[PDB]
Every structure is written in C-alpha cells, then in structure tokens.
Amino acid sequence: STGSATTTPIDSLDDAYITPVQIGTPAQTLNLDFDTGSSDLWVFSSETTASEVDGQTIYTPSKSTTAKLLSGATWSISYGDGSSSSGDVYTDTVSVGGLTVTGQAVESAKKVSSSFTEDSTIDGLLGLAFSTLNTVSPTQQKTFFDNAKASLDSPVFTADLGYHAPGTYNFGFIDTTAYTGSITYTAVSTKQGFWEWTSTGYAVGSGTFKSTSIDGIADTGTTLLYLPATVVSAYWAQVSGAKSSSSVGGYVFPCSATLPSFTFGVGSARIVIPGDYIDFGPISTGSSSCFGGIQSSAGIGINIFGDVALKAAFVVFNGATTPTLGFASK
C-alpha cells in the first residue's frame, strides 16, 4: 500500500504545516501537524476542556462506530517549546492520503496548554519519531508509521515541505519526480528516539565549506534551524546589524537586509537553504526588527534540523531494519 497527502503552511511564515487526516467511521477529518520529533498521535476532542478549545476541529469518539476506549491508558507530553497536552486513549481507524491503519492509538486530549488553544489551525499532532518515545501508559503505543510499515510497498515516508507553498507527505514510496539529482543517505541513531544524524559541515553564503560534524535531529515539528552557537554566530556575522537579543529570545536582524544562504552537508552532498527561507518577519507587527530562522541550540541540548532546513530538501525517512535518512535537492 501507499499514501500521499498534501501538507499546507498554517500561516504566511511557514510556522508549521497541517495535513488532513481521517479518523473514525464515518470519517472525521482533522488537520494534524506531522511531527518527526515526537511519537504521539493526539487530537483535540469532545473530551477537551471547553475553555481550552478555540476554533479547532474536534474528534468525537462517541460518533465513530470503530472507536474503542483503550481501557486504563493515559498520556501526557511536553514539547521542547514548553507546550504540553494530556488525556486518555481510544483505538480507531486512521487514514492519511488513502493509507489506512486499523487499531491506531488516537490520544484524546483532556487538557492542552495555551499555545495549542491559541492556534486554531492545528487540530492535533501526528508523531513520526520512533515509538520508543510514545507517552501512553501503562502500555506504550505505536506510531501511525510503525503500524502501517508492514503493509507499505517500501518501509519509508518522505517529507517534501514547501516554502510559502503546499508540499507533500508520502508513505510507502519515493516519488522520483519530486527531487533533482540523487538522494544522499546518511546514518541514523535511534538511541534517543529521534531521526538523529550527523551533518558533515556548513557554509555561509558563497563562503567556503567548513567540514565539521554536527549531530542533530530531523524534526518537521520544529519551525527553525537550531545549531551550535559557533555556527550561528558565523552566519549572523554576515548580516549587517544582526544581533542576539536576550529580550526577544534570539538573533534578530534589520528587516531591510538581504540574507545570505546557508548550506549544510549530507555526506559529500550539500543542501542550500536560500536566504529568504531564514526570514521570519517582524518581531512584532510593524517592527523593522526581523526574527532569524537560524538560532542557537545552546539552551536546548540538541541541534534541530527543523522546517527551515527540511523545506530546502526532499527528505526520506527510511524505516528499514536499520533506519537511515536521505536528502535530495529539489
């Protein structure tokens, strides 16, 4: 089997991407944030505290003839941005782009933190990291990809995120028309539950490539590119007037600037992030200070190849017995 679904930016900055997902019988379509940095499929629901729902579409398990309470199971998750959610668990039929999994754990939110409530465009998350990170207790549950894998033509999914435009998530096949050149594959460590890999270095603009190992995670659920302070300082030093602002929470730059590109290494291959992809616009409405799309990971504990980096590539998440990642230009 295969599936193919379009993913759409939630706003003019590409802060996140939403993909329609069919849950239950008859189908209830919710727009979920596909997140290769976490491993829970959770949704706003008829159980979510009413004051914490503000415009989202909800899953109502009582209206699904295939929903079943997973008795005793609870979940609770905290994300790197400080947001969180928790609740109980149903199993139900879940389809993405024509690919159907029966018995998928659908984690129904009873509580969500303010950032989720405040984003009316995201109805929940669909985790695509390794199932060892799934938070359901006392019986850990599998991701949608893990459940679908055996049925797929090939045990893979691909992320093809657009810059200011829709893109595609494919399951079970690699669309050879969706990228240019060849795909370069690189090793993955699953030890932390992430799609964790080692970039071979970087360049700033037209500068020379610096060969240096940068361990990090491929995370579709993180907006920006978070890298070591040395790398980030070298990038922003090429932008007149750029500075790190403790009050804003990262590097800012004059909105009048033209930003240089940023290149990262994948083995001997190179992925080029155009300068425009690094512009996240005014820090507040009408400001002439703009927020940078490359930020330091020094306070995180891990480097994160988020959407800024991934949208410059066609990315293969290879879930073979030994997982690997592939990157191609596009």
Curated annotation (Swiss-Prot):
Family to which this protein belongs: Belongs to the peptidase A1 family.
Disulfide bridge map: 255-290
Protein name: Endothiapepsin
UniProt entry tagged with the keyword Coiled coil: no
Peptidase A1 domain boundaries: 17-328
Recorded catalytic activity of this chain's protein: Hydrolysis of proteins with specificity similar to that of pepsin A, prefers hydrophobic residues at P1 and P1', but does not cleave 14-Ala-|-Leu-15 in the B chain of insulin or Z-Glu-Tyr. Clots milk
EC number(s) on file: 3.4.23.22
Keywords, sorted A to Z: Aspartyl protease, Disulfide bond, Hydrolase, Protease, Signal, Zymogen
Gene Ontology MF terms in the entry: aspartic-type endopeptidase activity
GO terms (BP aspect): proteolysis
Native species: Cryphonectria parasitica
Span covered, complete protein: 90 to 419 of 419
Catalytic site positions: 35, 199
Gene: EAPA
Keyword Signal belongs to the record: yes
